[PDB]
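Hi,

I'm pasting everything inline rather than attaching a file, because the server keeps stripping attachments. The sequence lines come first, and each chain or strand is labelled.
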Amino acid sequence: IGVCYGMSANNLPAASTVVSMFKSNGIKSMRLYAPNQAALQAVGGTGINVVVGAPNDVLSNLAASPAAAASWVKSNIQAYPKVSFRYVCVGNEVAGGATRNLVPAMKNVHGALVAAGLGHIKVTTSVSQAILGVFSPPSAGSFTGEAAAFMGPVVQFLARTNAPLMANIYPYLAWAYNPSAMDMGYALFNASGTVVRDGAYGYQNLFDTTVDAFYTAMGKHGGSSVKLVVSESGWPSGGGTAATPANARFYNQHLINHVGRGTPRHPGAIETYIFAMFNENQKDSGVEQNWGLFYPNMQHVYPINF
Amino acid sequence: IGVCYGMSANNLPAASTVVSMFKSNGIKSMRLYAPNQAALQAVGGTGINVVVGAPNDVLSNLAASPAAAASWVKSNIQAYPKVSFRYVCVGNEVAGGATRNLVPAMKNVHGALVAAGLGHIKVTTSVSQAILGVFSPPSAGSFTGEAAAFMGPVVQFLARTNAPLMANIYPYLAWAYNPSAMDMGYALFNASGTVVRDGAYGYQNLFDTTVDAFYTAMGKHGGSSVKLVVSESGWPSGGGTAATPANARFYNQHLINHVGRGTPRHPGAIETYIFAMFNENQKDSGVEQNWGLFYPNMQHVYPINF
Ligand SMILES: *[C@@H]1O[C@H](CO)[C@@H](O[C@@H]2O[C@H](CO)[C@@H](O)[C@H](O)[C@H]2NC(C)=O)[C@H](O)[C@H]1NC(C)=O
Ligand SMILES: *[C@@H]1O[C@H](CO)[C@@H](O[C@@H]2O[C@H](CO)[C@@H](O)[C@H](O)[C@H]2NC(C)=O)[C@H](O)[C@H]1NC(C)=O
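And the predicted assembly:
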């Protein structure tokens, strides 16, 4: 399992301490939202797989100038030969007109990587579950109209480069939108006795439903060979309805034990990253400040066996 | 929210006055059942979105001749450059053998719109909730055998053109059909909790159930990417059981406050049109003459905030 190393806080431990926590807890992969020099210098030579992101504010530059892309790769990838880079995630939940820069930026970063002999590092992007117009039933999975406009080209690029699509999937957020619309147990991996039939397949949790819905949506744009990586998933420990340490532990521990089995339509391990390592005090007040597995003081918010 | 501007009456205010009422009340969209000249002249330059219909009696002509369709578009659409046209609704609850002319007519109108540089105006059709063979539970939603025959091609045409399907949904009529079959509160938006449990999903009102049933039916015909627009919905203020100003206000005010959040399986705003602006004295005696938000003299039948 992997863990997202969010840094929107002013009281987190230093990078080398965090890298050490990953190692002592058995966390194999780390997702960074930007090429933080401290984190990259510290994670090198530790064996931890790294997903490094190109933040949304640099997308325009990477799309507009392939030279800028080669420079980005040189300064943030080639500069750290000891780091086990796995993917370069270009953008995170890019929206609006900025989506037009997505494919061009990915193409330019991809070209720069291959040229440096670093072509084993796959280029992808991370999308929100909100781009799904239909998630239930999974067999009818489709992207919304707006999303379909840019997702078509994105999915086709991933298919031709043999790169996976990254998706931030949060059963908690789908449920919290309207608590009366579905049983909480369905979103929490606690829906005993509940089997929602979709043709020949039976679903027991919202995570599987959403993952399979994404796969169906991708298949409609020529992406039947594209794998899905869950780049974010978690449950808040406070700040909102059902956001408690007990529910967060239940969700995350069940998630960890579940991803190796896969979904009804897609058996097999699903690469997953839990959001997030620490509670981040500089995010919005409410659930947003309570997504951490650890408190800034390094104490577990709740027990977890990775 | 939008409002249907029905004209089956002999004592309604002039079109320019009606348009003034739309503005002063905050009604953003208007549905016309025919390209009424007085109305189209009066609504131009107001910003009010317009759904214009091609009445059932002109369907065979539009289907048989591309030239007739181009002429219809020229006289009723191109002739009003100041009108904010949103959709062209070809037919309203077309039934029997006339349904064979549906797709041909839509194709011809669509072709004419594109050639004129008005391809942004989507072509659709409006169907009755009566074409649903099963509406409960929503996961089992499906069209009647007869409806399925023509709905397949209709939904497929809509999917290919990125146009929505319009549906006239009336919880009142479904309930009034057999009052013992369901609690009136369920139809009126006054149920306390979950009335229908569908797998992990909970429905507390008939409106949501019907909308989701339509989505399921469409998905079964290749229309999982097709959005639904509620082209009509309301509650009568007199002329029948439970038809009172208090119940009509309750239903309509709750609908207005509800549609922005969507349904259990389709969260998000649902484009909705309330039937209707005025009570229409040339309709059948009973509930049919009491669907209005306003009396012909322009007084509110009941207080409403849009
Ligand atoms: C997982 O689901 C079970 C079964 O619904 C939950 O256990 C019930 O919890 C309620 C709490 O009010 C009790 O009244 C019931 O008696 C419990 N059922 C049984 C069989 O003991 C359990 O709380 C859920 N777990 C989590 C973490 O939400
Ligand atoms: C909406 O539902 C409420 C609650 O069921 C109705 O109010 C109750 O009506 C009964 C009459 O049978 C009274 O005895 C209760 O005291 C009322 N409860 C409350 C809290 O007021 C209400 O009448 C319904 N509204 C509509 C328009 O049907």
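The CA atoms of residues 289 and 295 of chain B lie 11 Å apart.

If the labels don't parse on your end, tell me and I'll reformat.
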